[PDB]
């Protein structure tokens, strides 16, 4: 969800969990967690 | 063509149902303030890509 999570933030994502202001900013890398380490909520 | 109505974008701009909810021209947050003369939406169905 790269686009969900991300500047231009909007979703429950933003307004209920987590979206930091509109800063210049890098990103993340990919990799499997689930199944390369579940139950794991938002806020 | 639509009327004779109370709206409330609200439902629809939080409750991600909407996915690619990508939008032009207006605030999908001021949606659940402005008033418009009149609206018109058309509709369809259409591959993945």
Known sequence: ?43 | RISNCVADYSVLYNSASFSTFKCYGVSPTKLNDLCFTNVYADSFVIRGD
């Open chain 1, 1 to 43: 969800e790269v686009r969900q999570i991300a500047p231009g933030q909007t979703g429950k994502i933003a307004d209920y969990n987590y979206k930091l202001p509109d800063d210049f900013t890098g990103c993340v890398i990919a990799w499997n967690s689930n199944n390369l380490d579940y139950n794991y909520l938002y806020r």
